[PDB]
Design a protein around this ligand. Sequence first.
Ligand SMILES: [Ca+2]
Ligand SMILES: [Ca+2]
Ligand SMILES: [Cl-]
Ligand SMILES: [Cl-]
Ligand SMILES: [Cl-]
Ligand SMILES: [Cl-]
Ligand SMILES: [Ir+4]
Lengths: 185, 185
Amino acid sequence: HHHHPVTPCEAPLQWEGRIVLYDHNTGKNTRATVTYDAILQRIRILEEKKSFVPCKRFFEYIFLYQEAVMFQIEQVTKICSKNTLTEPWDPYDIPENSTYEDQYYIGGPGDQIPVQEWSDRKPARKYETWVGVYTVKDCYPVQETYTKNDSMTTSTRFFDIKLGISDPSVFNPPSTCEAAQPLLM
Amino acid sequence: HHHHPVTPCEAPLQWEGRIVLYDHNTGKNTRATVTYDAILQRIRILEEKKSFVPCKRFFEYIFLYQEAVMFQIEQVTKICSKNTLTEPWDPYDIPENSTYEDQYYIGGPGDQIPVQEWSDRKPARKYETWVGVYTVKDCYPVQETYTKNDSMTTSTRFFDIKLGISDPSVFNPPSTCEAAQPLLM
Ligand SMILES: [Ca+2]
Ligand SMILES: [Ca+2]
Ligand SMILES: [Cl-]
Ligand SMILES: [Cl-]
Ligand SMILES: [Cl-]
Ligand SMILES: [Cl-]
Ligand SMILES: [Ir+4]
């Protein structure tokens, strides 16, 4: 008998890593290099081009939540958009009041890792809007599903995570962002 | 005035590296990981698959010139061919009697490398059948063009070369080569 943990582990506050964003609404899998900083509430997201995908435009996003602004740079053409942020900062961590779902091992004999699953499950709602899988040892994000705001659901996978920000230069918006608010999409 | 060098540098005898084979006769660019051993006169060549090339079969070649045999393994299906070698061993080096052509730098200010060009040029023949480019410092192969045997010409580029054979296991033919001489092509 293992004690149901009273609160979730604390996710790391700063890291450089890579994600896949699976958007169910359009079926698109966006691959990205991420710089994540829950202390200054900024996140920088660089989309990746793969061989022979049939879209031609790739974006860098710099979310600066402490200055209420997001910059979106078309990577090739360097066209920059500057937009106001209305929405609060949302960390990649387990909220304090989350429901404990389970603990299990991912992978094989010898090469396997213990992880935990948390959710926002509560008896009043049939369906969860949030599920997070996090390592037991270091509380690193592994996967999140997020059903939020009338039924736009995303699935995020996280990998190659490295504690710390070895390159803070990425949060400086480029010279071209003396700029306006386009919808680039 | 630099003295015309009396003999070419001596190419390294053993290395692991990668090549591109450009065959003019068919236009095909074959990318390969190579294990090269001029002492035991063996060479092992592993073709590389790239995303969405329209051929489906990729070969490992183990040339054992000291036992007069070559093994060709279809990589996925592991079908093995065992063939006799009639042809003598040919090293990746500059033959002793080669004509000196030139010395120059490849690349830019700060990031540039000095290399030499040798050939089999002689006044009796209008066209060279062999041209080799080799580093000045270490005599590493950079590029060869080979017009030999009625006008089948190949161009080879060499890169990521590492002195020594850190993995001799590659010269052991697989369990499936209790086997016969197919033409796989
Ligand atoms: Ca969150
Ligand atoms: Ca040769
Ligand atoms: Cl790719
Ligand atoms: Cl790739
Ligand atoms: Cl590829
Ligand atoms: Cl690739
Ligand atoms: Ir690729």
